[PDB]
Amino acid sequence: TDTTPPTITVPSDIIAYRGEEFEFYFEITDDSGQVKNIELSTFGKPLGLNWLEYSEDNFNVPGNATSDNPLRVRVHGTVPLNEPIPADKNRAQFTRTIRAWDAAGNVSSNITFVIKYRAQTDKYNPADPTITYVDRLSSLSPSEKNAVEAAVRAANPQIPAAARITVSANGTVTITYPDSSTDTITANRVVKDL
């Protein structure tokens, strides 16, 4: 008879960026070849992450969780755009647990997984724009600022369309991401004297 609970592999680097959908997988195996169900919790208490969701496809089917072909549970969600980020980044995370059980009811211990979350600028790192030549490096014209923004945008299709690119009087570029975090492109990467 089966007296051995399932075993769970969790991803080691779940990193989510505010306002951007993430996904990851748990992999569950049981010696019977069948996993019945799982539970996500805060060490047995309610999960408390209403923006997280996981698929229950293929739960409780014979052969759904063998060593060769484990049960792969897709988890996805979006950390809130305005989720506060602690000053200490080791605390900018949610530590949670998962347990699973087989058809005989053998339940695993609580296995820890950690969802780290970060500002969008930690994902983003703008690429170099083509240089814009300007008449005065300390006082860009409106047309030159338009050109600078266009060039930053053209070089960075991977940055959210919803990010706003602004240009200062000296050609310094600010990129403000939807979560209000920012990147800066120094003027020497952006403009040169005509």
Ligand X SMILES: CC(=O)N[C@H]1[C@H]([C@H](O)[C@H](O)CO)O[C@@](O[C@H]2[C@@H](O)[C@@H](CO)O[C@@H](O[C@H]3[C@H](O)[C@@H](O)[C@H](O)O[C@@H]3CO)[C@@H]2O)(C(=O)O)C[C@@H]1O
Confirm or deny that 53 is annotated as ligand binding. no
Confirm or deny that 68 is annotated as ligand binding. no
Confirm or deny that 149 is annotated as ligand binding. yes
Asked if 42 interacts with ligand X (CB under 6 A), we say yes
Among 55, 67, 69, 139, binds Ca ion (CB under 5 A): 69
Among 2, 23, 57, 135, binds Ca ion (CB under 5 A): 2
The DSSP string of 45-114 is: B----TTEEE--TTTT-TTSS-SSS-EEEEEEEE--TT----SSGGGSEEEEEEEEEETT-PBPPPEEEE
Which is closer to its own copies, CB of 67 or CB of 180? Answer: 180
Asked if 91 interacts with ligand X (CB under 6 A), we say yes
- How far apart are CB 117 and ligand X at their closest, in Å? 8
Backbone angles phi, psi at 174, to 5 degrees: -110, 130
Asked if 57 interacts with Ca ion (CB under 5 A), we say no
What does the alpha-carbon distance between residue 75 and residue 42 come to, in Å, rounded to a whole number? 16
Could you tell me which of 160, 122, 116, 120 has the C-alpha nearest to residue 16? 116
145 binds, among Ca ion, its own copies, ligand X, none (CB under 5 to 8 A by kind): its own copies
Asked if 183 interacts with Ca ion (CB under 5 A), we say yes
- How far apart are CB 46 and Ca ion at their closest, in Å? 26
Which is closer to its own copies, CB of 67 or CB of 146? Answer: 146
Confirm or deny that 4 is annotated as ligand binding. yes
> Counting Cβ atoms within 10 Å, is residue 41 exposed (0-12), middle (13-18) or buried (19+)?
middle
CB atoms within 10 A of CB 78: 16
The binding site for ligand X (CB under 6 A) comprises: 42-43, 48, 91-95, 112
